Amino acid sequence: GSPNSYGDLGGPIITTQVTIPKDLARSIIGKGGQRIKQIRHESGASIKIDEPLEGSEDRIITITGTQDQIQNAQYLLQNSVKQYSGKFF
């Protein structure tokens, strides 16, 4: 109860940004995002995607949550890449 009183919530909140090539960016996001939404509930982490910067074939992602929630998310991002026809074409 009262998720805001001493305990430092295990630790302060941290934010980190990731850059993925546009080609792998589409494999990770999926068509309906069904992939970024699921990872959001499985990791418990929050993620915000920024629009691509005109003049760059890359997409940037921002992860926000506890270090562990972020690591669990960063690892699910690196493994989603294999969705690139890697796991079962």
From Swiss-Prot:
Effect of K48R: Loss of sumoylation. Loss of TP53 transcriptional stimulation
Induction line: By DNA damage, including ionizing radiations and phleomycin treatment or UV irradiation. This induction requires ATM kinase activity (ionizing radiations and phleomycin) or ATR activity (UV irradiation). Up-regulation is due to protein stabilization. Constitutive protein levels are controlled by MDM2-mediated ubiquitination and degradation via the proteasome pathway.
Residues with the N6-acetyllysine modification: K31
Sequence positions bearing Phosphotyrosine: Y6
Residue span(s) of domain KH: 13-77
Result, substituting D50A: Loss of sumoylation
Post-translational modification Phosphoserine, affected residues: S5, S46
Entry function: One of the major pre-mRNA-binding proteins. Binds tenaciously to poly(C) sequences. Likely to play a role in the nuclear metabolism of hnRNAs, particularly for pre-mRNAs that contain cytidine-rich sequences. Can also bind poly(C) single-stranded DNA. Plays an important role in p53/TP53 response to DNA damage, acting at the level of both transcription activation and repression. When sumoylated, acts as a transcriptional coactivator of p53/TP53, playing a role in p21/CDKN1A and 14-3-3 sigma/SFN induction.
Protein name from the UniProt record: Heterogeneous nuclear ribonucleoprotein K
Source organism of the structure: Homo sapiens (Human)
Upper lineage: Eukaryota, Metazoa, Chordata, Craniata, Vertebrata
